[PDB]
Amino acid sequence: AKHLFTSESVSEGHPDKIADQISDAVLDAILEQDPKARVACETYVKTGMVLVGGEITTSAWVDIEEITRNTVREIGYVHSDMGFDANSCAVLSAIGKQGVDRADPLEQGAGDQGLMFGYATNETDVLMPAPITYAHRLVQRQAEVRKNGTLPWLRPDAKSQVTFQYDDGKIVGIDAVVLSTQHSEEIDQKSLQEAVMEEIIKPILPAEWLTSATKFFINPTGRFVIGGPMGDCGLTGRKIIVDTYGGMARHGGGAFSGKDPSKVDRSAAYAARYVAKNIVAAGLADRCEIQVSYAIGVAEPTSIMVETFGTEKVPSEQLTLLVREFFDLRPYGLIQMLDLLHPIYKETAAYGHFGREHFPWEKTDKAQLLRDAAGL
Amino acid sequence: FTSESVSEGHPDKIADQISDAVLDAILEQDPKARVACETYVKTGMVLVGGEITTSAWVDIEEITRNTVREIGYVHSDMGFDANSCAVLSAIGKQSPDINQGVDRADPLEQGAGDQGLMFGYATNETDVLMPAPITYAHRLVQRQAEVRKNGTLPWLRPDAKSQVTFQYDDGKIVGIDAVVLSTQHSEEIDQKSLQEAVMEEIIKPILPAEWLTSATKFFINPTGRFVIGGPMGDCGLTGRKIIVDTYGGMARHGGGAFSGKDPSKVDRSAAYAARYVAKNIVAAGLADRCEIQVSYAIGVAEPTSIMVETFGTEKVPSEQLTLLVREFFDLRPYGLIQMLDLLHPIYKETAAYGHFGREHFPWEKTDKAQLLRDAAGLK
Amino acid sequence: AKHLFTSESVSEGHPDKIADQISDAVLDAILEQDPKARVACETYVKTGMVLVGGEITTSAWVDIEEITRNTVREIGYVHSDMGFDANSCAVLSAIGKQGVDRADPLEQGAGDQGLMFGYATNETDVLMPAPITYAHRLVQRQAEVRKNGTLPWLRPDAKSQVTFQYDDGKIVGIDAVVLSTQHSEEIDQKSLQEAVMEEIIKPILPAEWLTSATKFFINPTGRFVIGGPMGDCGLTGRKIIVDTYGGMARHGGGAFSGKDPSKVDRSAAYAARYVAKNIVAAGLADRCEIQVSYAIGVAEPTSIMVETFGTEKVPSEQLTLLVREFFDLRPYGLIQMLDLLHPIYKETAAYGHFGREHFPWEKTDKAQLLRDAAGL
Amino acid sequence: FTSESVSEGHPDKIADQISDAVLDAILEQDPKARVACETYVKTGMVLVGGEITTSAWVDIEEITRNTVREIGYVHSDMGFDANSCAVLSAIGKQSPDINQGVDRADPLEQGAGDQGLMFGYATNETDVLMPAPITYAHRLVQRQAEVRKNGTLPWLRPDAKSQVTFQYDDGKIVGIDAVVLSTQHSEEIDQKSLQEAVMEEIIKPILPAEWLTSATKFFINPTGRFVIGGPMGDCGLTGRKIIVDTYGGMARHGGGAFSGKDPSKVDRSAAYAARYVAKNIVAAGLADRCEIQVSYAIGVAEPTSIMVETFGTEKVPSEQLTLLVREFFDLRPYGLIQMLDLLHPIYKETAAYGHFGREHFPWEKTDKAQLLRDAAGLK
Ligand SMILES: O=c1ccn([C@@H]2O[C@H](COP(=O)(O)OP(=O)(O)NP(=O)(O)O)[C@@H](O)[C@H]2O)c(=O)[nH]1
Ligand SMILES: O=c1ccn([C@@H]2O[C@H](COP(=O)(O)OP(=O)(O)NP(=O)(O)O)[C@@H](O)[C@H]2O)c(=O)[nH]1
Ligand SMILES: [Mg+2]
Ligand SMILES: [Mg+2]
Ligand SMILES: [Mg+2]
Ligand SMILES: [Mg+2]
DSSP: OOEEEEEEEEOTTSHHHHHHHHHHHHHHHHHTTOTTOEEEEEEEEETTEEEEEEEEEOSOOOOHHHHHHHHHHHHTOEEGGGTEETTTSEEEEEEEOOOSOOSSGGGOOBSSOEEEEEEEETTSTTSSOHHHHHHHHHHHHHHHHHHSSSSTTEEEEEEEEEEEEEETTEEEEEEEEEEEEEEOSSSOHHHHHHHHIIIIITTTSOGGGOOTTOEEEESTTOOOOSOTTTTSOEETTSOTTTTTTTTSSOOOSOOOTTBOTTOHHHHHHHHHHHHHHHHHHTTSBSEEEEEEEEOBTOOSOSEEEEEOTTOBSSOHHHHHHHHHHHOOOSHHHHHHHHTOOSSOOGGGGSSOSSSOTTSGGGOOTTHHHHHHTTOO | OEEEEEOTTSHHHHHHHHHHHHHHHHHHHOTTOEEEEEEEEETTEEEEEEEEEOSOOOOHHHHHHHHHHHHTOEEGGGTEETTTSEEEEEEEOOOSSOOOSSOOSSGGGOOBSSOEEEEEEEETTSTTOOOHHHHHHHHHHHGGGGGTTTSSOSSOOSOEEEEEEEEESSSSEEEEEEEEEEEOOOSSSOHHHHHHHHHHTTOTTTTTOOOEEEEEEEEESSSOOOOOOTTTTSOEETTSOHHHHTTTTSSOOOSOOOTTBOTTOHHHHHHHHHHHHHHHHHHTTSBSEEEEEEEEOBTOSSOSEEEEEOTTOBSSOHHHHHHHHHHHSOOSHHHHHHHHTOOSSOOTTTTTSOSSSOTTSGGGOOTTHHHHHHHHTOO | OOEEEEEEEEOTTSHHHHHHHHHHHHHHHHHTTOTTOEEEEEEEEETTEEEEEEEEEOSOOOOHHHHHHHHHHHHTOEEGGGTEETTTSEEEEEEEOOOSOOSSGGGOOBSSOEEEEEEEETTSTTSSOHHHHHHHHHHHHHHHHHHSSSSTTEEEEEEEEEEEEEETTEEEEEEEEEEEEEEOSSSOHHHHHHHHIIIIITTTSOGGGOOTTOEEEESTTOOOOSOTTTTSOEETTSOTTTTTTTTSSOOOSOOOTTBOTTOHHHHHHHHHHHHHHHHHHTTSBSEEEEEEEEOBTOOSOSEEEEEOTTOBSSOHHHHHHHHHHHOOOSHHHHHHHHTOOSSOOGGGGSSOSSSOTTSGGGOOTTHHHHHHTTOO | OEEEEEOTTSHHHHHHHHHHHHHHHHHHHOTTOEEEEEEEEETTEEEEEEEEEOSOOOOHHHHHHHHHHHHTOEEGGGTEETTTSEEEEEEEOOOSSOOOSSOOSSGGGOOBSSOEEEEEEEETTSTTOOOHHHHHHHHHHHGGGGGTTTSSOSSOOSOEEEEEEEEESSSSEEEEEEEEEEEOOOSSSOHHHHHHHHHHTTOTTTTTOOOEEEEEEEEESSSOOOOOOTTTTSOEETTSOHHHHTTTTSSOOOSOOOTTBOTTOHHHHHHHHHHHHHHHHHHTTSBSEEEEEEEEOBTOSSOSEEEEEOTTOBSSOHHHHHHHHHHHSOOSHHHHHHHHTOOSSOOTTTTTSOSSSOTTSGGGOOTTHHHHHHHHTOO
């Protein structure tokens, strides 16, 4: 049936995303020395200050301040005229804290309870829903043209939102686009709107989806000079829908950034994405949602549901069987299936954990095996 | 299907309750205040930050300690003490270049304060029109009023987590296939006497639903000793339980957190309105399950999208539903506030045991169902 | 006997003095609404952040953030290139907390124990010791030429130190001068030294005391661009010797800033200065040190010692008698004798609480009465 | 004359002990580390900030909690708990544009790291050559080792303050004219039984000095109930007891704080050397009372001033003393370090009950007195 669906994203400069990146920069720094470290790093950014807290247990020795300043600096906050300066902001630290419980580590019980969802759809090339996919690309393009000097008056903080029109489960076009970007005093709003349209929006959104009825809200309130942590708190794990599927799929409720792979909240979400994407990549369904749940201390998932919204190209009972045959969804089994014990997570902390074809859980190395195990 | 909840002693929930305690305190004096209160709780301290624009004069430390006493932290043995903990505040005033004054001759036409997407959901699986798993997870952890009325004080400590795994045949509840209840306790009780008291003293609200067949896996303290909890050895932030606050995974979510936000923040008020729309659609008999998505663009009063999903359970053409909602509900940001009468200090009660399913809240009223049913042409 | 004596001072931009000024700016803001408020405000300034804490009890409603930013801004830290920005630094608050115990408030017992010292000497016009006096004037002159644009490349943080040569208890000249000033990248060290000599040192130090043997250490280590809270913590009450007599006199050990006048640690120190200065101003002695001590809950001082280092012009027993006849040294008696219940204390928090002739405890309105009560 | 001291339970002293605990921990691994550790203690939290340049890897929280346990805060009833309090750190690394490497072919010729003035003092009023009032104020509050060895645990809480008021005739001790001892206590003792136990159980170190004539005013808990103390309801910062740390008001002070500073900070090492010079002058019989002032200019190795004050008690021309000190002591910043053997983790013990008067410290040695007396030509 005809309907609209909307998703949003934010740039690496949005204060919530700043916190997520700092949390995963600390995780990456620790994993490079202690691949098996336990990390639960919560970050809280506000005017003038970064607070890094949580609980950690590792043999690694890390400089929290240096990691934090480097991260903020890469994001681009390097001057008080931007509202935040990586070189002079305060950095505060408030981090704290059986061994071989299984003969086979792959049989360790879940370190926590919870349910996670994976999703895939052949709407886009990356098998992600269209709204979240192009919302990410808009804020990522904003950062791209900000850093390479194409538009030097841009500033780090920005938000996007895309409203897609669907009909009979197929995409007809784009109904509304929102893009709010921080900027310096130099540029006027008229010049800003045209440059964002020409350098950010038009190069990213397929023209076939842009009709005369599409609304374009470019800095709808106008002046956007004060941004980032100034005038807006940022906390880790406050963008979990931006991080996953933009609302197209359900969500178990767990945040990703700041957590080592032993947190099923994170790695099982990655594994769920890995199965759903391989099912859709194998031609076994157009759209596929995977629900997995874990009981603490239990290795086998307490539930595995495969929903294909009537788009399955083989019986539903055979899909759920293939999922069990080709994927190891035990907490520490999926860690090895995805090779998650490496410092690869700072890159996930902005622009979406799902959609980019270089992360382990985005590989489709099992798609050909799945359709072979089903016929075609 | 599986869904989980947490108690008022959980650190994340502590942060929500503090943020809404601060909000409620401000609304008592300035019902039109702008509040964005973000709370951080860690071993030994509370940090309350954010931005507020109000004429009210409140006491953040006093509000914070009172919130923590009620939750039941008044001694260092529990791992946290509301009387001796540290309370830091980092709250700024009016963010420059925002409040442009009147702006609109009709205040109901004001633009939204931010972009964003919100979801509402209703299902006639229960007399409160909520999804089954999440609904009784709250009532489970909420029966800790026994430890306040001295019904049974014993050994239980606040921090708790529930998980119920149902299974469906044709969208109908088959039964309970797995119950996970992990609770913090004291040293004055063993894991054997614990798991027996846990499986017995959780039945008074859980109803005579003997859905626990011979194939229902129970996990009461499956890991073992659970003595240290709360902020001690675990960090809590507001807005880190948004799936617990809403529909426990059954319905989708837009990502916005509720606590610490005044009603002019669409992230909260529009989620409430979405629940108000879906519950009234179901209550009116126009559908058995209903999910609503709204979205806003900053500075725009009209929602940029409205989607009504009935999952094939509608009793009237779906396009008709979308039109009924557009006219029978005022989904403009400041029309929601008037439609729900939201400018009141009612939000601390929400930050604890679910924002939906408790029918004394304005967005739980089904005062439009009959009107909707009449306009829909049924009967 | 011949000897050298040295004292130091710091500018309003030195991080310890930043904390003192913030503490007394909060005190002033409270006293303007609640003259009888109880204030004990401790401030802690570091890279990017100001922490204001302590214990207060008042009917006043004050905006700690606004008071703090205004204070830092007046000091001059307004840009991340200076290492600190009043507009974007973090401000954290950690403030907490019988009535009519006496029929006559003047008889209330001391709110705390302690001993305090006052000092006066006719060496200088303001009846202060020479070293501390001119150390203050150097850093105060540094700030004066920084703000009025005479030397716009100066920055707020600076330190001074003057070594005086004494002989037979009389001043012969100045043996060494140290002046370290923060500055921007623009100025080179050679140009900086000459400008500090011409605009700061020479206009302040009497030429009769500057001989060819006087050492001048102007930015002895050279480059001084990073200053203020960056690279150096500041805490309230860490300059108590700069605040009093530069070491020429003994010190009871109590800090001034952040305390309301009910803290004998502060107001009794002021009263002691008031008596010593009036004794010297009356011609009753060349140099005079006053020691007073208080027992908690006791109104009358538990000791009053008057030391005149052999310079007394009347018998010692008569000086101590005159002190008791003309000065009310009870805790709440000296408050009324000096009219201390007004927001006058932010001005004391840099450049010395003693020496400036507009504070109440620097008035010599009793000098003529003292010498009349003794003859001449 | 009057002088006061405080115990290791006083919040300011807690901050000093933490700063030197951190310093000592670093020196154990890097004896040449640069440390400037500033500690803030408030109800429920410790904030450890400053700057350090070291190759050592320490644990600030672990060091902090251990320091607070020893002081005796392990339960929320005392107002503070070392196991549940918050510990924040804000410690930066090498301040840019400072360490220029070698700089000098003879390391003893390095310039001072900062300007500043320092005082030392010695008097033969006591076998430790310290002023009377302050010397036994420390030993008073230090006898709280009874509450550690279970000698007498009872009701006393850490926070305590002493004050003794002597009087002089011709520089000779006449007697005690006023004793003020206010101590924090528990609810398991009244102010009557308190003041009796306070006046009786403080005599074991106070010696048979019955200087308490009929005119000696005693003030034991003169205000009354003293139950809440420590960081609870009172703020503590390092370097806020510098007169207690030194000579209790008898001698003058340069303003620099000791704790949290490594020996290359003249604010500490030169104050120690000043005490070393004065004590050796008195011990050698060259004077009965001696006060020394030194000062430094940043980047200059030679003190910018040295003043010897004998208060008329010298037994040799005063100008000769100033010359003897210049040659028999190396008062250059890095010569002090070698002269006193300061690159060792010995500083936490100083942050508690006075930096001077305890003869096992390097700066309390009188190993030059005889040499000084020989060079002075006496006997
Ligand atoms: O109560 C029960 C629950 C499950 N079972 C059976 O356990 C079987 C599952 O075996 P398994 O977990 O070892 O298979 P798996 O592929 O998931 N193993 P891996 O994850 O690839 O390592 C099921 O066939 C189920 O019928 C019972 O017999 N009784
Ligand atoms: O034990 C004692 C101590 C003091 N005294 C006497 O109290 C007298 C002090 O009186 P006072 O305190 O009222 O005089 P004052 O000028 O200080 N009063 P004010 O501070 O100006 O209000 C002294 O003369 C002293 O001899 C005793 O008789 N016995
Ligand atoms: Mg926020
Ligand atoms: Mg949002
Ligand atoms: Mg410092
Ligand atoms: Mg100093």
